[PDB]
């Protein structure tokens, strides 16, 4: 398989500007005839990836002019030169030169703002849970950017459990904000056996973790 | 003026089977390079099957993820191309994409989704998770609805009471060991809306039920 990578992973920008997302290769998609196999898809959610360029330069009908394709040979570039909204999504280079055929990581279009530290807010388990013999305690960050958090739970001050459900949304409508909760699941037995329950993501923002705490006990 | 359609996917079990058909209606099916795709969810594009036609011999490659596993082929006219997955491995779960090619371009599918457990059609076991040693609370207050061990996919959250414009934010479900966990939540205002109210109200058509659970 040829390692098709691109760069950035993520972009912030803002509706006006302007992308260069990087995708570059294994070896020279310079096929002999018809040659050079490179395709540039986006991909909106819940949709099929549609392409907007194939072999490099070769825009694709419908595809707005304010696309580009660079590139030769181990190296490409394709270019948003003026960012419409419309344009959000995750950007994807394939390569049809060199079987397996290849997708890179994609890149993602995203708004670009401040806006925000997560609101941490904790949450013990509920009786009905705990006489369900099931007991998870559950923490969201509301509301934050740039997207990079890092949640952890802390059991009686030193705990790691491997019981969590950790779930993500990007926004794309108003605050342009992304969102986390985070969910530690025991046994009713684990439950009533500890106290001291905490929640403690370091962020961007940060500089230091962000913890929230409860304990059996009391919080 | 062209169409690539995935015909036929869901649940299967860990195991082996499906077989899967696509149809693309508004080019020469005959003349192309025919071939199935694949992002589990959390999972990226990775390339899965292909086939060519009379001047290649219609050759046939398969990748290694699933090589002498899975299989595609194809019939001309209304010419329907076909992956066979007689082998789940679960892994193996994403939306699996249909798509044509031709020299240079290629057009892809709405793709059919492959979903694979031992899991049975489960109920999810709905909690209410109310601001309760937390500040935000008192100033604002967010209460979230945890709704786990329901399988499969297709449950639907759904707020109320209080009474107001309030920040609802409810996460993709996820796929724990067998069966999808679920939350929703509200910061809604400090006792104001507090004082007045808050159900949370969750259903699955998908077969058991809809349950509600209120906050208080
Ligand atoms: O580029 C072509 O000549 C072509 C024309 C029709 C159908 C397939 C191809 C085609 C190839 C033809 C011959 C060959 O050795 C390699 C080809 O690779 C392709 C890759 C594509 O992504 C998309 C198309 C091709």
């Known amino acids: 398989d040829v390692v098709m990578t691109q760069t950035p992973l993520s972009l912030p920008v803002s509706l006006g500007d302007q992308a260069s997302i990087s995708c570059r290769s294994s070896q020279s998609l310079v096929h002999s005839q018809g040659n050079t196999y490179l395709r540039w898809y986006l991909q909106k959610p819940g949709q099929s990836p549609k392409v907007l360029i194939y072999?490099?330069?070769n825009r694709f009908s419908g595809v707005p002019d304010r696309f580009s394709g660079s590139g030769s040979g181990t190296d490409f570039t394709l270019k948003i030169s003026r960012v419409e909204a419309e344009d959000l999504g995750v950007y994807f280079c394939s390569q049809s030169t060199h079987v397996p055929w290849t997708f890179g990581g994609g890149t993602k279009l995203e708004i670009k703002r401040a806006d925000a530290a997560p609101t941490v807010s904790i949450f013990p388990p509920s009786s009905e849970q705990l006489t369900s013999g099931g007991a998870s305690v559950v923490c969201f960050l509301n509301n934050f950017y740039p997207k990079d958090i890092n949640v952890k739970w802390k059991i009686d001050g030193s705990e790691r459990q491997n019981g969590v459900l950790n779930s993500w949304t990007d926004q794309d409508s108003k605050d342009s904000t992304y969102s986390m909760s985070s969910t530690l699941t025991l046994t009713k037995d684990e439950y009533e056996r500890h106290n001291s329950y905490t929640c403690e993501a370091t962020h961007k923002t940060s500089t230091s973790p962000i913890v929230k705490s409860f304990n059996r006990n009391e919080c | 003026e062209v169409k690539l359609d995935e015909t036929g996917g869901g649940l299967v079990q860990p195991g082996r089977p499906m077989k899967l058909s696509c149809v693309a209606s508004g080019f020469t099916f005959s003349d192309y390079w025919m071939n199935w795709v694949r992002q589990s969810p959390e999972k990226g594009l990775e390339w899965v099957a292909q086939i060519r036609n009379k001047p290649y011999n219609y050759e046939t490659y398969y990748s290694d993820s699933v090589k002498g596993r899975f299989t595609i082929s194809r019939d001309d006219s209304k010419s329907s191309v076909y992956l066979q997955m007689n082998n789940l491995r679960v892994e193996d779960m994403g939306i699996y994409y249909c798509?044509?090619?031709?020299?240079?371009?290629?057009?892809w599918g709405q793709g059919t989704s492959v979903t694979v457990s031992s899991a049975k059609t489960t109920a999810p076991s709905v909690y209410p998770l109310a601001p309760v040693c937390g500040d935000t609370t008192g100033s604002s207050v967010t209460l979230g609805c945890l709704v786990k061990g329901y399988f499969p996919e297709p449950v639907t959250l759904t707020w109320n009471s209080g009474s107001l414009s309030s920040g609802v934010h409810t996460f993709p479900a996820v796929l724990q060991s067998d069966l999808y966990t679920l939350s929703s939540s509200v910061t809604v205002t400090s006792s104001t809306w507090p004082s007045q109210s808050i159900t949370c109200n969750v259903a699955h058509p998908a077969s058991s039920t809809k349950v509600d659970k209120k906050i208080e």
């Open positions: 798509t044509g090619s031709y020299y240079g371009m290629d057009y």
């Open positions: 072999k490099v330069s």
